[PDB]
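Q: What does the assembled structure look like for these inputs?
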Amino acid sequence: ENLLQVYQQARISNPDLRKSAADRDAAFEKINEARSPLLPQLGLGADYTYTSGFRDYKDQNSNVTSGSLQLTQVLFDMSKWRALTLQEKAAGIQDVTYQTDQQTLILNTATAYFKVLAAIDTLSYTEAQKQAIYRQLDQTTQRFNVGLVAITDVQNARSQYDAVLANEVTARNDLDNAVEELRQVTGNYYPELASLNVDGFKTSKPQAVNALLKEAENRNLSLLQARLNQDLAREQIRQAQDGHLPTLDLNASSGVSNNRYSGSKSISQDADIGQNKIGLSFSLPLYQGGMVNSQVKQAQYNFVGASEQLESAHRSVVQTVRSSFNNVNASISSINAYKQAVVSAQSSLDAMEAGYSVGTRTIVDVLDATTTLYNAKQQLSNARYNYLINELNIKSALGTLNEQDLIALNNTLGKPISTSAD
Amino acid sequence: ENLLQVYQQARISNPDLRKSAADRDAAFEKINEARSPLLPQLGLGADYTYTSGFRDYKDQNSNVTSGSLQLTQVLFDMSKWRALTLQEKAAGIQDVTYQTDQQTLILNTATAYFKVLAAIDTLSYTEAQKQAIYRQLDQTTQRFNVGLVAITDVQNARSQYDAVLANEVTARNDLDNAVEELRQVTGNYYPELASLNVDGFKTSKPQAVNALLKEAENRNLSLLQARLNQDLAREQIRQAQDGHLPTLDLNASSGVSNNRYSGSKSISQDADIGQNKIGLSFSLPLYQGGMVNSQVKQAQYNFVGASEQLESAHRSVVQTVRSSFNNVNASISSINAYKQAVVSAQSSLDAMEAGYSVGTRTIVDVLDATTTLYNAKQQLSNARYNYLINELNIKSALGTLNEQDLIALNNTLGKPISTSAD
Amino acid sequence: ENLLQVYQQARISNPDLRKSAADRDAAFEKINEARSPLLPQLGLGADYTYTSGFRDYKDQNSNVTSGSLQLTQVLFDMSKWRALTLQEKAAGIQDVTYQTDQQTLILNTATAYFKVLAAIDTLSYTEAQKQAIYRQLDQTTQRFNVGLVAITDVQNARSQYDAVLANEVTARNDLDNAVEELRQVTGNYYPELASLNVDGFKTSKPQAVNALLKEAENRNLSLLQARLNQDLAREQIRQAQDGHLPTLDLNASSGVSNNRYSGSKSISQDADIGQNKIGLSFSLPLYQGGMVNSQVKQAQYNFVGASEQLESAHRSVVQTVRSSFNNVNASISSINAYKQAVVSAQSSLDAMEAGYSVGTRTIVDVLDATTTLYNAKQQLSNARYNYLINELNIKSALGTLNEQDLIALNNTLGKPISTSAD
Amino acid sequence: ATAKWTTENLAKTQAAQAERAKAAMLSQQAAKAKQAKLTQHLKDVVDRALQNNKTRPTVIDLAHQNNQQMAAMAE
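A:
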């Protein structure tokens, strides 16, 4: 119906966002799985054994029934604290990816909607071109049936008309596919969409590219992901060089046992045993074969790789920001150029009609001028829609693409128009 | 030689299929590795130790030589049964991926074969345009050397001829590259391929899009993979919330030992001991720090993500089915339109030749009409081949693409034609 | 400034290469982590326990404080030797990937340089076309203001002129974006680049395709990666069927303990214990439930998959080598064809100007001839640049792309030219 | 040559699309290489994790025989 309602339906139903949100929540919950090993771990065990000896122990059999309640707590284990911190950072990265997916949905919805609008305009101008060429063909056919013109003009007009008929077929198919893609994005079939208001259509120059680059370096999401991955690589170095450190544990236990010795040579006696241990274990790896040093060096190389990914992301951001700036400026210049071209092509079409009436020109020239005029109109329409999409591409490069940027567009739109290819 | 024989060599030799089959079989064998932990694990161990004391134990040395034969069986461990079931589901998913790869091979074979045929047609039409323009150029050169025309026509004809020459170069290159891609797909160089029978070429409208969508929902493979991934996520939830459960074990052992105490203060005596234990161990975790709850919540979020992937696959299937329907209908309409265009272009070309003979027109018009005619012919051929590929694309969307769909085509084909660019 | 200096800045600053080098070094360092298990693994431990009995042991409490220095060495463990060898092969594969990335950088730098040059030429020929059409338009406007021509020609010239202005806008934008992408590749903004020397431009036929295919099979990197992956899969089979084998260990230990028994019913006495063990452990799995057999079969299927990947890589290499050969030959033929087309188009433009002066032709024909001429010039330029890129693509297929292949080009270049779109 | 110029430019754009396909194939080769590197990395990591930890006498067999030696020790 318009761009806001389309985007709201999409945001509510689009499954890609809901999957990205699922991933975000899965990471933010895995934080707790990573924190768990630091919390007291209680377990229970129970054993039943029947031991029988066969060498200097013949006829010395035993029946043991034991049950233990083991507890374990970690007083000092830095590898697990680093794992918890690593998981927090990974959750942050997932949140940034979710933001990127929100922006991707906004941009895809806008692009699909305007693709449908562009396809409606293309079909409308293909039909107008067909009507114009058919008008010329009918005029020539009449002037021939009367005897004021030869069959050459009739045949030429017919050939041009048939070519335009094939273009109409292509345009109808493209419109149908544009509507199918829009429904894939949103989830609904839209028979009427708000159309662009070409009368109240304004082209504003984007702000200086230096301000765009500053805001992009500060806000762009492909950079936040890279900075967070760099921090993650630093924390991975720290986790790696935390293997030299010792660990403490507070293993406690409450055990009970029932021993029943049953054998002819069984000298031992039955027992009902109990125990309550409160232990404290300390571990300190001294030499691991160079495993820890190698892990630390690998982590340092991974940090170098992450820094280089950050530089690559910065270069891609700069490139895309400047490209979008140039593309908007070019779309403005193109809108103005095509407006002039459309005006001059209408003038030239009138000139060809006059010349053909006075005999200075031919009919192939008239039909070529008609084709030129309607190609200029199609190019102007596409230029407007590409200007809108390029504004959106800038706002995406800065990472500041949100619903208000769609409210602006929805304000640029106007009366509804049907998406049916009829 | 034709499409069936080409497809047979491809299916027999194509390495992508054989790799996908290797992956399928590897998964169906990993099923057994996943089932193994539920079977009796039998192991053997042997130790030799020399113990020496140095605090309240001086001169109390020992030489122990022990050997044990341990056996283990799992009477209750649901995590391992769930792992086995997960591996069965993963094997099913691999089988579906293999089916998708079979269909992909069929589609690629047909697409490459028709690409070769289309390239042959394009080269033939470019050569026919070259010959037509060369005839016109020779007529003008003769009529000029005799004096019935000026050099303007000769020079215009020469320019058009040179343009056509450049197009011929491009077309030959395209044909050679198309034959090279066909060889990449199949594995053989085909100097003769069965050509399309344009005389007995029929275009049948595809069945209603509702029937296509029903059969697609029922058979399409991008949906079977998604449904199987959803079931896999459900079983992963079950596996995760199967950590609260206890486990039972049937640890058995047959051990023997020889202790030799040798020391001045060695009060103990030598011994040759044996033992046969038949144990039963029971394990039950009561608390782990929210590990299992966190895993279950993560599995639930992954199941949500899998459901959203299923919805995304449903939308993609609907979109592609409707797109293929529209593309077939458009290709039919385009075949008809381009037939009419070719007939009208031939008429207009005759009209231009007549007019040039009577002086009403010029030669640039004649050569433009020739170009138009042969462009229309090329477009008609491309429309036929695209109609065939679009029929295949529908049959692929429904997941019902098999050898019989190629038998239909191979019946659509006809006399052989050479793939050499000469 | 030229291609060598550009490539040097790129090679020194390009972050993709530095990341690939980081990955290479990380693998070559992980070799040591993989070698670490084989080396001795010294470790320390210390425990403090307070045991208290409550069933047949009331008032029998103990306080034990122990400290151990454990050492471990691996005398026979083939799984770990196979892991070390696997890591070494993975390091080799990473080195080959680094080489592929070097070639990719060379190719991308050259492609960006020549894309910028092509854009500059395209904007030069669009400006030239604009100036030519403006001269024709001004001449017609003057001859009209004097009264020697009608307004029809003025309006047609205006329409053509406006169309060229819109093309000029597009060309300026394309040049700006080409500069942005070149800066993304290298890292600097180049206001002046060495231009192509079209006077001393030669096209040499590449060597026979059989020699190309031999050199590719021997040197191409997509094949070295595939062969190394095949060897890696074979070594994985070996690692898998090395699970049937036993393992030996040299477990040594130096332990000390202090037991303090404190209880009313505590019959035992305090102790200050020491021990020095030098053990030798032997492990041998006899049955695991088809685990090892299943792993071996999975590894064999993975080796089959790797062999099929190798065959796929061989087919891709053959295809790309022959394609690059055909593309170079086609670019040569296209250079020649477009040279002849430019000559013929200039002749035809002069012919149209003469005819228009004598009235045989019209002005739309003159402007069409101008457009044709300058399109031919653009096509010739693009053909030259594509010939250079296709030479580079051959040299990439053979895997012999290095700095000397760039020295050849840099010698093919000439005087500098400005990249500013003004 | 406009009737021919349009089709010429369209065939040129098709050749450029084929070049784009080749570039996309190089991209997919890069991505597949990265996936293979990740696979071999996880492979080596899992082999290391399940080798060293288990090579130390953590088997129930070895512990059981050591327990027999400790049992013999007190007699």
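DSSP finds nine helices and nine strands in chain B.
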